[PDB]
Amino acid sequence: RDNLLGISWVDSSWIPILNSGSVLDYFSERSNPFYDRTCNNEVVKMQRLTLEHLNQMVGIEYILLHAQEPILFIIRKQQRQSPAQVIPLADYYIIAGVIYQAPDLGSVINSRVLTAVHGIQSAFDEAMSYCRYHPSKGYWWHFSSIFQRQRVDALLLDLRQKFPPKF
Amino acid sequence: GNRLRFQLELEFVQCLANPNYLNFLAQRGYFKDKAFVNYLKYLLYWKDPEYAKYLKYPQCLHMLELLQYEHFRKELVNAQCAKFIDEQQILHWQHYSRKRMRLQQALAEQQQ
Amino acid sequence: QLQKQLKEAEQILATAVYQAKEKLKSIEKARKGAISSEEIIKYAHRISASNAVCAPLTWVPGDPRRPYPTDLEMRSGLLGQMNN
Amino acid sequence: QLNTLNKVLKHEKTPLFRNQVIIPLVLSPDRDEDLMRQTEGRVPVFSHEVVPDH
Amino acid sequence: MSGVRAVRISIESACEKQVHEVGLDGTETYLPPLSMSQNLARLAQRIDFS
């Protein structure tokens, strides 16, 4: 209950017996952090029959939004003021029988920027301690040719021509 | 009691044969503690036959040995690691069985 | 020529005795190996009673039968249940 | 420069970002040569692991 | 028949061929060449020089 975005809930038995008809039931298994007893689908189950009753009694109605037959089954949480009036609250998507909450385009980006820049800041602090700059010297970071080589290179090319390389 | 110790240790060693649980423990940082390596070293008593007699899932023992190399625990924090190890495990299993069966059947049918 | 032939013979001897040493190593493992057969049969039945030793007849890429204790078996498994 | 620019962009009369919700339509284990090109080599063949991971 | 008597039966390890690498879509790989005569030079490669 700390962070609904950071919770995942699953159950193996319901996994093989999963179909477009049963997705709402899987969300409804109860003891599932994302869904709640307050939702009216639960009230409908407590009563009898599920038909156009979600358009009659209008309120919290979890409804399937988009479905791919094997695994992908997206669910949407709506709050209805009246028939033909829908207000979307949140979206919970089920991938491979694993339910997650759809991250906000912005909460995700905020957390993402925070982790990257925290890493950059740790690296910077460590590098600053590594440095040992002084008024004398460029910056101690603690924490040639004798020019007789042209004749040597001439001799090298001479022995190259004389003794050819053999792969 | 010692009975509960035995049962919990058996369950834990049989559970260690799961790459998902291994990646779980590696990501959660349980391997970095010097207590878990000593616990693993103590867990080597399962190699005895009297203790191996109670192991239903034997695939764990070999895996346990790898955990002692001290380079297996530094890696495996990645999910691709669990991916690849479970891939190779299930591949060895299913391919060995079904490939022996299919090779025998196909050779018997072709030679006739 | 004699030296070359001798060297070839030496190599042959080496490989042969290396294979003999491998056989000796097997024999040393085998000596400690001898055990009750009934016990072997019982252990084979234990490891083979489930889908662990042999892949199932109809086991394609998509099965709850896993080479490990799944996750529902873990959820009721003594391990974390008693740690809780 | 980059961080200041990003924060500045996020806070200049831009749409409310907590409103929108990211939802995946289709996942196919098929090889894709276009997502590999588009994301510059990482994240190829939109599989099942990649949506809980990202 | 009844009351089977278990005797000291010794069995040798069944290591005739090993599957070093297992590829996808079948295709078994028997990398292990089971050699030593060349393994001495292979280990000599590991030996240092510097």
């Binding site: - | 891939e87 299913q94 | 890429p61 998509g62 | 284990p29 599989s47 099942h48 | 996808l24 879509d25």
Partner: peptide, 10 residues
């Protein structure tokens, strides 16, 4: 189609 793949999809 596309059941979760323990071995890789063929």
């Amino acid at each position: 189609s596309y059941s979760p793949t323990s071995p890789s999809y063929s």
